[PDB]
Copies of this chain bind each other. A is one copy, B any other.
């Protein structure tokens, strides 16, 4: 039944912390795997007010870069605020200078570079990002801020997502609003050794459903041969003391438009895939199965923007109020969509999904639109399987079995989940008054199976007579606890990150 959080410990996820001067040694319980050698780098808000001036939204707090270093079964923790224009000017003027997602600054358009969302590699470099034109080059060893990079200096995009796809050779793919949506390709580091960002190019363009209103895009799908873009009814009103949140509106009638592009031939495919309205933030994985694309999504059922429920005032409320606030919110649901690549007019009015292992359907209509119904993989009442992660390096863009997720209880993260996407079997890790982060999968170096390895999660546990936070290591097989690295300081919410092997 319902898991309750009356003690309200989750409030510590949204509480300001101070950065460290140097790494702290973490107290190890259990056994840190001896093959686990490298850095867990994660981004989140760390400063939720500048003096007496508050930040209002979950995505407003100033970017804090976190690092757990693993070597010979020992763990250190280090955090440094990213020296963005937003942060630097805030410390200088002792006020909010740059307008954030849901917080207007008061004394042309100074766009935020608050890189609080994710960090990803480009060539030999690492970049913290939000979803604007500004990404921040950071030192993954010292957590020092190196440089601000404006993507508009290199390619035709107004912004880019915090969820670029990274191929094994180091090629980076991303999507951004431009009205159309452009796929950016950043090549691997060449022999010439010059900045790969200076060789950035637009490979393909997706059309927009509304001439003057682009959809919000958080992530996209990538296979060896295809790019998948999901156009949601969450629209940016370009016509609109305003912040970014004030620009969003919901298109009630369009539902969801799904788009595919040939990756290698760099060409948009004019297949009009249509389905019912949902919010989409995170693609889980995409792959090719005969003449079909399998598109696994973390969906929110409805066209109301889920971000409306993520103001800090609401997330800091007592548990009964948090539950009441989420009553009319979109319902989370993991959905498998199946997109047919071969459309035969002779099959008009019929289900084109001939695959033997799915209940997903695709109806070819007379107007040539292809109406999709999903196969539901996971559905819990206001219990989201979110911040999805897979064995990305080996199974990204390919047939796969296992996804790992953060479980959201009325938007409060309170458990870690593993989903078998073929059988729909689930595993759960949960402890009372313990609020984990996105689980990141690290393979055992001699892995035979897809789930031979561990998942790493940063957990807040502020209950009296306990360590306030710890790094959790679970066995990827059954989410059984392997170890914890405990610290004696709070760690606020983190969204995304990576494991950097050394």
Q: Which residues of A contact B (CB under 8 A)?
A: 2, 250, 252-253, 275-277, 301-304, 327-333, 347, 349-361, 363, 365-367, 371, 373, 375-376, 379-382
Contact = CB atoms under 8 A, between A and B. Distances in A.
B356 A328 contact: no
B331 A351 contact: yes
Contacts of A352: 328
Given A252-B365, A277-B363, A363-B302, A351 B379 contact: no
A365 B233 CA distance: 13
Contacts of A329: 351
Nearest to A369: B252
A379 B335 CA distance: 13
The prevalent SS among residues of A at the interface is loop
A359 B301 contact: yes
Contacts of A301: 351, 359, 361, 373
A347 B329 CA distance: 11
16 contacts: A252-B365, A275-B276, A276-B371, A301-B351, A301-B359, A302-B350, A302-B373, A303-B349, A328-B351, A330-B361, A331-B353, A331-B373, A356-B381, A359-B380, A359-B381, A376-B379
Contacts of A349: 250, 252, 303-304
Can you list the 7 inter-chain pairs with the closest CB atoms, starting with the nearest? A327-B354, A376-B376, A359-B379, A301-B373, A328-B350, A301-B361, A331-B359
A304 B327 CA distance: 36
Contact of A302 (B2, B252, B358, B361): B361
Given A252-B366, A304-B351, A328-B351, 5 more contacts: A252-B367, A277-B363, A302-B361, A330-B361, A333-B359
A295 B275 CA distance: 22
A361 B353 CA distance: 26
A336 to B, nearest CB: 10
Nearest to A278: B373
A303 B379 contact: no
A276 B329 CA distance: 21
A357 B379 CA distance: 11
Contacts of A380: 359
Most chain B CB neighbours (cut-off 10 Å) among A329, A331, A353: A331
A303 B363 contact: yes
B330 A351 contact: yes
Nearest to A361: B301
A292 B177 CA distance: 41
B371 A277 contact: yes
Contacts of A375: 379
A367 to B, nearest CB: 8
Contacts of A382: 356
Contacts of A303: 349, 363
Contacts of A371: 276-277
B302 A356 contact: no
B361 A347 contact: no
A367 B253 CA distance: 10
Contacts of A330: 351, 361
A83 to B, nearest CB: 40
Contacts of A277: 363, 371
A302 to B, nearest CB: 5
Contacts of A302: 350-351, 361, 363, 373
Contacts of A365: 252-253
A357 B373 CA distance: 23
A30 B258 CA distance: 56
A279 B489 CA distance: 58
Contacts of A357: 381
Contacts of A276: 275-276, 371, 373
A259 B456 CA distance: 50
Most chain B CB neighbours (cut-off 10 Å) among A2, A328, A360, A365: A328
Contacts of A275: 276
Contacts of A250: 349
A355 B323 CA distance: 12
A120 to B, nearest CB: 32
A420 to B, nearest CB: 15
Contact of A350 (B304, B347, B376, B379): B304
